[PDB]
Design an enzyme around this catalytic site. Sequence first.
Site, PDB file in Angstrom:
ATOM      1  N   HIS F  18      -0.258  37.209 -31.844  1.00 55.93           N
ATOM      2  CA  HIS F  18      -0.428  35.815 -31.413  1.00 55.93           C
ATOM      3  C   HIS F  18      -0.524  34.850 -32.488  1.00 55.93           C
ATOM      4  O   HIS F  18       0.112  33.565 -32.409  1.00 55.93           O
ATOM      5  CB  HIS F  18      -1.497  35.521 -30.224  1.00 55.93           C
ATOM      6  N   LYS F  42      -3.870  40.657 -12.768  1.00 56.52           N
ATOM      7  CA  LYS F  42      -4.954  41.674 -13.332  1.00 56.52           C
ATOM      8  C   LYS F  42      -5.946  41.094 -13.821  1.00 56.52           C
ATOM      9  O   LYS F  42      -6.130  39.904 -14.487  1.00 56.52           O
ATOM     10  CB  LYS F  42      -4.204  42.502 -14.796  1.00 56.52           C
ATOM     11  N   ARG F  91       8.674  40.114 -27.918  1.00 60.96           N
ATOM     12  CA  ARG F  91       8.484  41.421 -28.468  1.00 60.96           C
ATOM     13  C   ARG F  91       9.314  42.481 -28.241  1.00 60.96           C
ATOM     14  O   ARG F  91       9.976  43.126 -29.165  1.00 60.96           O
ATOM     15  CB  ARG F  91       7.049  41.992 -28.056  1.00 60.96           C
ATOM     16  N   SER F 129      -2.271  42.975 -27.132  1.00 64.56           N
ATOM     17  CA  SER F 129      -3.477  42.713 -26.237  1.00 64.56           C
ATOM     18  C   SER F 129      -3.954  44.492 -25.824  1.00 64.56           C
ATOM     19  O   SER F 129      -4.892  44.772 -26.345  1.00 64.56           O
ATOM     20  CB  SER F 129      -3.713  41.650 -25.416  1.00 64.56           C
TER      21      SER F 129
END
Lengths: 176, 159, 159, 176, 159, 159
Positions: F18, F42, F91, F129
């Site tokens: 990031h 989530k 990504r 992450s």
Amino acid sequence: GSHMASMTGGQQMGRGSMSTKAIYPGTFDPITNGHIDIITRAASMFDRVILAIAASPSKKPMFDLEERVALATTALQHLPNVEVMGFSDLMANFARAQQANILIRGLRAVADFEYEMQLAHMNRHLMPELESVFLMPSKEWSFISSSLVKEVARHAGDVTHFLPANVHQALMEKLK
Amino acid sequence: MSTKAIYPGTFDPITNGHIDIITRAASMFDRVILAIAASPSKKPMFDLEERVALATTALQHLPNVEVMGFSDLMANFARAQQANILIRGLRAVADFEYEMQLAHMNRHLMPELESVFLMPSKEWSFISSSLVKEVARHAGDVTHFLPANVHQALMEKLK
Amino acid sequence: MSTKAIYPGTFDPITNGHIDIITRAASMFDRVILAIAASPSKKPMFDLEERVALATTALQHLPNVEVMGFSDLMANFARAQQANILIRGLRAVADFEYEMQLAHMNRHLMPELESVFLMPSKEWSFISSSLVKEVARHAGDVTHFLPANVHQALMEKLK
Amino acid sequence: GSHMASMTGGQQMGRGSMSTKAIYPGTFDPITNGHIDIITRAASMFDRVILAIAASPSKKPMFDLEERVALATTALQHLPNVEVMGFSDLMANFARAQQANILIRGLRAVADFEYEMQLAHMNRHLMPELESVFLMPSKEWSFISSSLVKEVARHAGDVTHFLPANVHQALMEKLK
Amino acid sequence: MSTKAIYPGTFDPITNGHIDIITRAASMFDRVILAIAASPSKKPMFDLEERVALATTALQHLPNVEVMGFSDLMANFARAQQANILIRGLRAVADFEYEMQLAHMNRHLMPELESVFLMPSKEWSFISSSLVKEVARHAGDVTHFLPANVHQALMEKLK
Amino acid sequence: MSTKAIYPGTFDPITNGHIDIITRAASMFDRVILAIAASPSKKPMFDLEERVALATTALQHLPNVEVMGFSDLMANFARAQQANILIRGLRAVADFEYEMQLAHMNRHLMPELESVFLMPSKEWSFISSSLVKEVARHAGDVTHFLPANVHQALMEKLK
């Protein structure tokens, strides 16, 4: 040929056009214009279509089975060969109970293609006589989903272009 | 009422995969045309004549199918033949992306044409006209992937 | 018994990416052949001899690795060299479907042949013989990507 | 700061916004509305944009470099910060020659994503100070390409909606 | 070099797909461990002990294959077991991105562990425990999917 | 003239990847807001407060970046902040299909907002992450992938 009933009942394949009855399963929580387009296009090329609404999905739906079924019925009333119903089994088993020979699947993204191929193999294993037929969504509707429309709507984005009026009003009602 | 479907391709040559698609399609639609491209981008092993004749024999047993050559915009052919449905088989992801684009362009050219997609049987899921050729061109057994009439014609081309 | 593996391709010329793939195979399999297709689909920049030569030098430091040519189905050259393993480089999801196709066909052809798939090193994941040459053809710097013998050869080719 | 030139000329990262000059490479054979959308969007967010037209594509183009450059110049002349140029080099070398720091790439299909990522790694290796920036096409132009427009046009299909007038004329003229 | 391989998964239960993958791994490497994840994210139908048992029985005919549990980083279990090879069975395109991620991360965690991908047999390429279970939660013959012991055990578990 | 961009996310926590994206973005646009989602579907490991705090310290060195929490429709947020550019990192292929859908929707919701996409560095191409959390959770060394402030806070959380 003519009075051939005494000799044979007839096979499905190799012998010309047979009666077609399609199921179009999903959760339809709620039905969007993308759904309507798909089922409209299916009803145009197959004899009968059942919009089959899953009674107990994995994630708790925003609309109950009774609300989903009533909203889709209204939105689909203008199609004479479409019937809306709830179900609670494998689409294959419901299909068999319904004597359906076509399974309609919407084919929206490349991500889904692998899953759709697998589901179709499994469904062929389960119910060989069930033919899966795949329709791409109209350009108009290619990015919308029930999920996305609810989440835009929760935060007050304009979603009137994506839903029939009956659904849009029900949706606003659910969101306060 | 009446449905009339076009199944377009190069069919150079027609394999068991194609026959499976068209058989399934011909059970759901009143009539099917196998529409064979006259002038494909890549010059084919078999000419239109050869392709059409092989396909015609391979699908002779299906009452409601017709094999034809075409050499114009699919929109105009389908319109010529008063067909309302375009049938494509979807083997691989790569092929879906491209078919989706063509479907959008065909929606523009002919709004009353409905594109519809079928997936191959698991049995034919890996074969293509191109693969059967390259295998047979190096003597691999391809008798399982082709009707006899087509096998023979292929063996004949490689001698 | 033993394991004998084939790593096929055009290697025109071979790059550090290939040399990585074969180094990793040669550590897990008793013998490995770098199988350089003689007649690739497009004409190569280096003729089979230059290629076989360049690869031979580049891989000299590997004890159980042989550099050979081959003009036939991989399942034939495999058979011919008494090989049980086929090495495939596997870079992108865009290759995976095509590679899975070839794998099914090679099983059909030669069911005793095993396709083994290695991912290239992150260092070499974006390079190819093609890109390396295109880059070199306009005097871009490709010294990081080739062993010196190859880099020297290439420079000489572009004069 | 004030006149730190005596002390430093300044580096590109870690110190706020810098002048931006983008190249938008392609064959543009010919330029479509999709192309025009990409570069318009680019020109609204970067200082200058160069439409770079490949002199010698791999496949023989329908329009020559001279014709491609003229058609684009005209289609783009309403954008004050856009220049159109031919080039016969690596996009990375041309960008270096041109003192560009942004590379514009259109991002239309899943199939290209990994190729694009790979090209962007190469270009990072070739010219570290060159940044690749990726734009998606408008829904409106999502399906068109030069190739598809040419092949539709060859068979007399209506492509007036996908091309600027100058290009649509050039094109009918090639296909007479 | 000497080759010892790890084949990790939940195996809840094992299927003929897994058995096919492990068989093929088995036949190219000296030793293979079927590494069964002890605490998978979602709670498994079968507990670790049952899963290991079902597996051991199923693969008993493979001399050079041992089943084991594991409840840590795959890289660490591999380092502990002195394994130099990690086995992934690549079914679909979708999973390949995610497997390429893990492989890069394992190379970071354990540089001496080589990742090796095997594609499943055409036969098994659609089957997946989770699928089978969800089929078997309703109806439909899975006799061709599972080995006898697993078949029976699953049948028992149903009601 | 002036450009102001939003980079939205959950950043739970922010990683080196990031930071790479925002650094690159802050070199090409006048101002960048890191917009941190208040209520992810989530439940995150770090709450909004911690997420913003870590992010603020991580990006403190970049003169023209601000880190903010948001809990509404991006369209209204960007409109609220007078931002004309939305920055997403890209990504994987999976991420692209989904991102393209939202970009269409955002174009419906806010025509004057331009969505823009950047690929990660090769360095950070495989990290996320979720994956760093999962490696850390089983004690894997993840010091290469996070800033010191963030690493410390993660080790704390996992004790």
